[PDB]
Structures are given as structure tokens and as C-alpha cells.
Structure 1
Amino acid sequence: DGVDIYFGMPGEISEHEGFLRAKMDLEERRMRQINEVMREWAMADNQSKNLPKADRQALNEHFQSILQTLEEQVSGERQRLVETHATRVIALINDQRRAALEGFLAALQADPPQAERVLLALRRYLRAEQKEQRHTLRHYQHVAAVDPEKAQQMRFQVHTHLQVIEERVNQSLGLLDQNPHLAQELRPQIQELLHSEH
């Protein structure tokens, strides 16, 4: 129990499928609980006509309240599932960007620098940044699609994050410019990369 949670999900399971799986398990679990409550409600409701006013009242009050509690648990649970998943998606994206930066740096500091190795290490870093950019855009797009007031409030933050990504890209291309010969030789390929990743 406390042990299985330590080991977590087996490696053969991606965060994405693990997330969907968890989401479906909870969907099914809650559907059964709702059904059980609705069934109990129907049973009791069938006897309502032969009850005194006060008992009739305490009876509807009873089920409305149980459903209130269940609605709160379903909602609180989804919120927890969504946060856990969003946090992990973001961390992976950040981890991959950092790993790719390290690799690009090593290629640059090699004695001597191999154009093809530098271009590929850079490509990987740019793709890590494209992934982060798409993540930012998709998140905003999702909020706008389902919640307008929140979209408006995050507008500037999206713009800012996109400028941070743009600056990391320029900073990386600046690292490549400390080796003129190399930069000139790779400019045409890098331009193609920057265009397609847009």
C-alpha cells in the first residue's frame, strides 16, 4: 500500500496513458456511486406520498445533501488529477529543455567542434523550445475555449512567456556566434529550422 505508492506506476506506462487511465477509473467509480444514490432516492421517493410533511421534507433534504457532498468530492478529485498531470507535463518539458541545452553546449565545447554534431544538438534544443511554446499556446487556447474571463487575465502572461522562449532561442544562437566560422556554415540550416518550428 504505502509501498506500491513508493514504486508508483511501472516504467512501461507514460504519464499520458497513466493520466487517462486514472481519469477513466474515477469516472467509472463515480458513475456507480451516483447510480447507487439515485436508486436509493427513487426507493425512498416512492414512499414519500405516505409520509407526514416534515418527513417528506427531511427526505428530499437528505438526498439533495448527499448529492451535494458527492458533487464536491467529484469536483475536488478532478481538480487534484488535473493539477498532478499539468505539473508533470511541465516538469518534463523543463527537464528536456535543460538536458538539450547541456548537450548543445558540449557539442560547442568539443575539441574540435563538429558542425553536424552542433547542428543536431541545436535542433534538439530548438525542438524542446517549440514544445514549450506549443504548450503555452495550447493552454491559452484551451482556457479561451472554455473560460473567457480567465483567458483575458492570462493574456499578458502568455505574451511574456513567449518572449522568454524567444530570448532563450536568441541566447542559444548567440552561443553559436562565439565561433564565427561555425555560425556562418550553419546559418542556412538553422534558418530552415527556425522557420518550420514557427
Structure 2
Amino acid sequence: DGVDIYFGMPGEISEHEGFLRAKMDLEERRMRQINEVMREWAMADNQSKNLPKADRQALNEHFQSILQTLEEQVSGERQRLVETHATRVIALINDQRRAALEGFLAALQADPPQAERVLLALRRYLRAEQKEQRHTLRHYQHVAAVDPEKAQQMRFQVHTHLQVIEERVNQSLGLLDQNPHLAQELRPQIQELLH
């Protein structure tokens, strides 16, 4: 138990993979739980054709009540799973951006900087920022797809988030602009990457 939780998922299993699998295991488990309740309810239905109405009514409430508890257990479980996954995705995106940023700095702070090395570290950094950009747009696109009202409310926040990302890229590039020659040299190579 506690020990298995500590080790957690094996390294051979990615977050995405483990996430789908946990989602599948949870769904499969709740599908069975619900089915059992439904069959008990059906069995009670057959058995009670002749009890008085008040008792028939109580039986119905009993099962509708058990199902409510189950539906609420289901919702919480899902919400948590979805919540955890979203957090790990954001963390991975931030971690990759920071890693790439450090790599870009190193290449820049090299006794004799190397055009190829700097350019590739910059591509890496730009890609991490783009992945944050895609992620921001996809989340918004999705809420718009399933919840119009909710999408209208995050609209301005998304717009601002994309701006925050752009400013980070301009500021990070500016660092390359601290080396005129290097800047000019990578100019056409840089532009292609941005566009």
C-alpha cells in the first residue's frame, strides 16, 4: 500500500498513458458498481409488486438514494483524476520551458559562443513556449466546445495569458540581442523559427 504509492507508476509508463489507464480502471469499476445496484433494484421491483404503495415508494427511494451517493462518488473521483492530470501537464510544460531557458543561457554565456549551439537551444526554448501556447488555446477551444457560458468568462484571461507568453519570448530573445554580431548572424535563421 503506502509503499506502492511511494514508488508510484513505473518509469516505463508516461503520464498520458497512466492517466488514460487510471481513467479506464475507474470507469470500469463504477460501471460494475452501478450495474449491481441496478440489478438489486430490479430484483426488489419483481419481489415487491404486492407491497403497499407507501412501502413500494420507500423501496424506490432506497435505490435512488444509493445511486445518488454513487453518482456523487463518481463525480468527485473524476474531478480529482482530471485535476491531477491537468496539474502534471502544466508542471511538465513549465519544467520544459525552464530547462530550455537554462540551456539557452548556457549557450549564450559561452567563452566563444557558437552559432549552431545557440540557435538550437533557442529553437528548443521557442518550442516549449509554443507548447504552452497550444495548450492554452486547446483548453479554451475545449471549454467553448462543451460550455459556451464558461468560455465567455475565461476569454479575457486567455487573451492575457497569450500576451504573457509573447512578452516572455520577446524578453528571452532580447538576451540574444546583447550580441549584435550573433544577432545578425542568426537573424534570418531566427525569423524562420518564429514564423
Fold similarity call, TM over 0.5? yes
Deviation at 1:54, TM superposition (A): 1.8
Distance 2:48 2:61 in 1: 12
Q: Which runs of 5+ in 1 are unaligned?
A: none
Deviations 1:62-89, CA, capped at 9 Å, x for gaps: 0110111111011110000000000000
Deviation at 1:48, TM superposition (A): 2.4
SS of residue matched to 1:162: helix
Deviation at 1:114, TM superposition (A): 0.2
Distance 1:157 1:18 in 2: 30
**Percent identity of equivalent pairs:** 100
Deviations 1:123-147, CA, capped at 9 Å, x for gaps: 0000000000000000000000001
SS of residue matched to 1:82: helix
Distance 1:52 1:166 in 2: 70
Distance 1:64 1:137 in 2: 40
Distance 2:157 2:104 in 1: 28
Distance 2:37 2:90 in 1: 38
Deviations 1:125-175, CA, capped at 9 Å, x for gaps: 000000000000000000000011110110011001100110111011100
TM, length-normalised to structure 2: 0.99
SS of residue matched to 1:12: coil
Distance 2:144 2:116 in 1: 42
TM, length-normalised to structure 1: 0.97
Deviation at 1:47, TM superposition (A): 2.1
Distance 1:110 1:74 in 2: 55
Distance 2:54 2:177 in 1: 83
Deviation at 1:92, TM superposition (A): 0.4
**RMSD, aligned CA:** 0.7
Deviations 1:63-120, CA, capped at 9 Å, x for gaps: 1101111110111100000000000000000000000000000000001100000000
The answer to whether residue 77 in structure 2 is matched with residue 77 in structure 1 is yes
Distance 1:70 1:124 in 2: 46
Distance 1:137 1:50 in 2: 59
Say how many residue pairs are matched.
195
SS of residue matched to 2:145: helix
Deviation at 1:52, TM superposition (A): 1.3
